[PDB]
Scaffold this active site. Structure first.
Site, PDB file in Angstrom:
ATOM      1  N   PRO A  15      28.490 -27.160  31.301  1.00 30.62           N
ATOM      2  CA  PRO A  15      28.628 -25.704  31.306  1.00 30.62           C
ATOM      3  C   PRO A  15      29.153 -25.011  30.084  1.00 30.62           C
ATOM      4  O   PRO A  15      30.335 -25.628  29.561  1.00 30.62           O
ATOM      5  CB  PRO A  15      29.160 -25.311  32.711  1.00 30.62           C
ATOM      6  CG  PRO A  15      29.723 -26.146  33.163  1.00 30.62           C
ATOM      7  CD  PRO A  15      29.016 -27.798  32.454  1.00 30.62           C
ATOM      8  N   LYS A  45      31.708 -30.200  37.574  1.00 30.13           N
ATOM      9  CA  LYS A  45      31.062 -30.933  36.376  1.00 30.13           C
ATOM     10  C   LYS A  45      32.602 -31.438  35.641  1.00 30.13           C
ATOM     11  O   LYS A  45      33.447 -30.563  35.595  1.00 30.13           O
ATOM     12  CB  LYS A  45      30.534 -29.784  35.133  1.00 30.13           C
ATOM     13  CG  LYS A  45      29.166 -29.518  35.931  1.00 30.13           C
ATOM     14  CD  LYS A  45      27.974 -30.020  35.486  1.00 30.13           C
ATOM     15  CE  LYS A  45      26.836 -29.294  35.659  1.00 30.13           C
ATOM     16  NZ  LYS A  45      25.373 -30.063  35.303  1.00 30.13           N
ATOM     17  N   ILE A  83      23.803 -26.081  33.548  1.00 30.33           N
ATOM     18  CA  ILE A  83      22.591 -26.505  34.137  1.00 30.33           C
ATOM     19  C   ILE A  83      22.560 -27.070  35.588  1.00 30.33           C
ATOM     20  O   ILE A  83      23.539 -28.011  35.901  1.00 30.33           O
ATOM     21  CB  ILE A  83      22.328 -27.758  33.080  1.00 30.33           C
ATOM     22  CG1 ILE A  83      22.093 -27.591  31.920  1.00 30.33           C
ATOM     23  CG2 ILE A  83      21.371 -28.916  33.647  1.00 30.33           C
ATOM     24  CD1 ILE A  83      21.850 -28.620  30.700  1.00 30.33           C
ATOM     25  N   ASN A 129      27.996 -12.433  33.619  1.00 30.26           N
ATOM     26  CA  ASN A 129      26.389 -12.825  33.756  1.00 30.26           C
ATOM     27  C   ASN A 129      26.426 -14.255  34.039  1.00 30.26           C
ATOM     28  O   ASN A 129      27.103 -15.097  33.401  1.00 30.26           O
ATOM     29  CB  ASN A 129      25.859 -12.473  32.474  1.00 30.26           C
ATOM     30  CG  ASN A 129      25.815 -11.024  32.413  1.00 30.26           C
ATOM     31  OD1 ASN A 129      26.048 -10.273  32.993  1.00 30.26           O
ATOM     32  ND2 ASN A 129      25.532 -10.516  30.979  1.00 30.26           N
TER      33      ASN A 129
END
Ligand SMILES: O=C([O-])/C(F)=C\c1ccc(O)cc1
Ligand SMILES: O=C([O-])/C(F)=C\c1ccc(O)cc1
Ligand SMILES: O=C([O-])/C(F)=C\c1ccc(O)cc1
Lengths: 114, 114, 114
Positions: B1, B32, B64, B97
Site C-alpha cells: 500500500p 501488509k 491492493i 481518500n
C-alpha cells in the site's frame, strides 16, 4: 495523458532535459501526440519505501485508453528504465499507479474530452 | 500500500520518526508487511478546509485489497488519531481518500503486480 | 469535495484570496456547503504541457456525487475561466480530473461518510 513523479531525489539531480525526454518517450509508448502529454516531476520529497529513506519514487500515469494488462507491463519496463538511468532510483523502489480515465471525466480547454 | 499526507503544517512540526511510525501503524492495520508500504508526507502546503487556513490535511491510502466499507472506518479512526496526536490536526479537518487498486494497474520493478 | 491545483505559475502570482474564492465558487457550482470544501494549491511546480514550460495547470476535483458528463463540462468552463482570469493560464493548458467518490471511501472526522 499525464505523468506524475514524486521522489525524495534532490532537484539538483534531475537532469535538465528530463521532462522533455519523458514527453517524447511517453508519446511513442502510448501512441498519443506529444501535444496532449503533461509531465509533472516533484523532487526533494519526504518519503519512505519499505521503511527506508533510500531513493524511491511514487508515480501515476493517467490516460484515456491505452491502459491495460499488457500495456501497463510495457509502460513499467520503460518508466522504471528511465528513472533508474536518469535519477538512479532502483526499479524495485518505484510504484506506478495506472489510471484509465473516462473521457467525460477529463476536463480541458473549458470542456471535457467526451 | 501507499499512504500520502498533504498538510499546511510546517515541515518543522513533523516529528523526526513520523514516517517510520506511520509505516509501522499501517503494517499493523492493513496486515501488509512494512516491506510493502510506502509513505509520503508533504508539509508547508497552501490549503484551506471549510474556508480557513487553520491546520488541516488531505490524505490518500492506496492498497491492493484490504480496502472496503467497514474496514475504512477503522483506518479513519486510526489515521485521524495519529494526525491529531502527532501533528495536532483536528479530525474534522482531515479528509482521507481510499482507493482499492487492481494489481494489473500497479507497476513495480519493471513490470506490474499482475 | 476537495479541489487540487498543481501549477508551474510562481507563488507570488497567486492572488491573496484565491483559495477563498475557489471555495465559494465551488460551493456554488456543486451545491455543497463551503464547510465541506477543501482547496489545495501547489505553485512553483516543475511541469511541462505539450513539451513546453509555458504556464499550465493539472487539477483534480473529488466529490461524493455531483459528478457527471454534463456537470463536468460545466465545472470545466467555470474552472478554466477562473484559472485564466486569476492565474493567466490558457484553458488549453489545463487538465482537470474528475472523481465521483463512494461515501464509504472518504474518511472524515475519524470515520467515513457511509
Ligand atoms: O490521455 C489523453 O487522452 C489526453 F489527451 C489527456 C489526458 C489528460 C488527463 C488524464 O487524466 C488522462 C488523459
Ligand atoms: O499494497 C500492496 O499490495 C503493494 F505491495 C503495493 C501497492 C503499491 C501501490 C498501490 O497504489 C497499492 C499497492
Ligand atoms: O464532497 C463531499 O460530499 C464531502 F463532504 C467531502 C469529500 C471529501 C473528499 C472527497 O474525495 C470527496 C468528498
Amino acid at each position: 495523458p499525464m505523468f506524475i513523479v514524486n521522489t525524495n531525489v534532490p532537484r539538483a539531480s534531475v537532469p535538465e532535459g528530463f521532462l522533455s525526454e519523458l514527453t517524447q518517450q511517453l508519446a511513442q509508448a502510448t501512441g498519443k501526440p506529444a501535444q496532449y502529454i503533461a509531465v509533472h516531476v516533484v523532487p526533494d520529497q519526504l518519503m519512505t519505501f519499505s521503511g527506508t529513506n533510500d531513493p524511491c519514487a511514487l508515480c501515476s500515469l493517467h490516460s484515456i485508453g491505452k491502459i491495460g494488462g499488457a500495456q501497463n507491463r510495457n509502460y513499467s519496463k520503460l518508466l522504471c528504465g528511465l528513472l533508474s538511468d536518469r535519477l538512479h532510483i532502483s526499479p524495485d523502489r518505484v510504484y506506478i499507479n495506472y489510471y484509465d480515465m473516462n473521457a467525460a471525466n477529463v476536463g480541458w480547454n473549458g470542456s471535457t474530452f467526451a
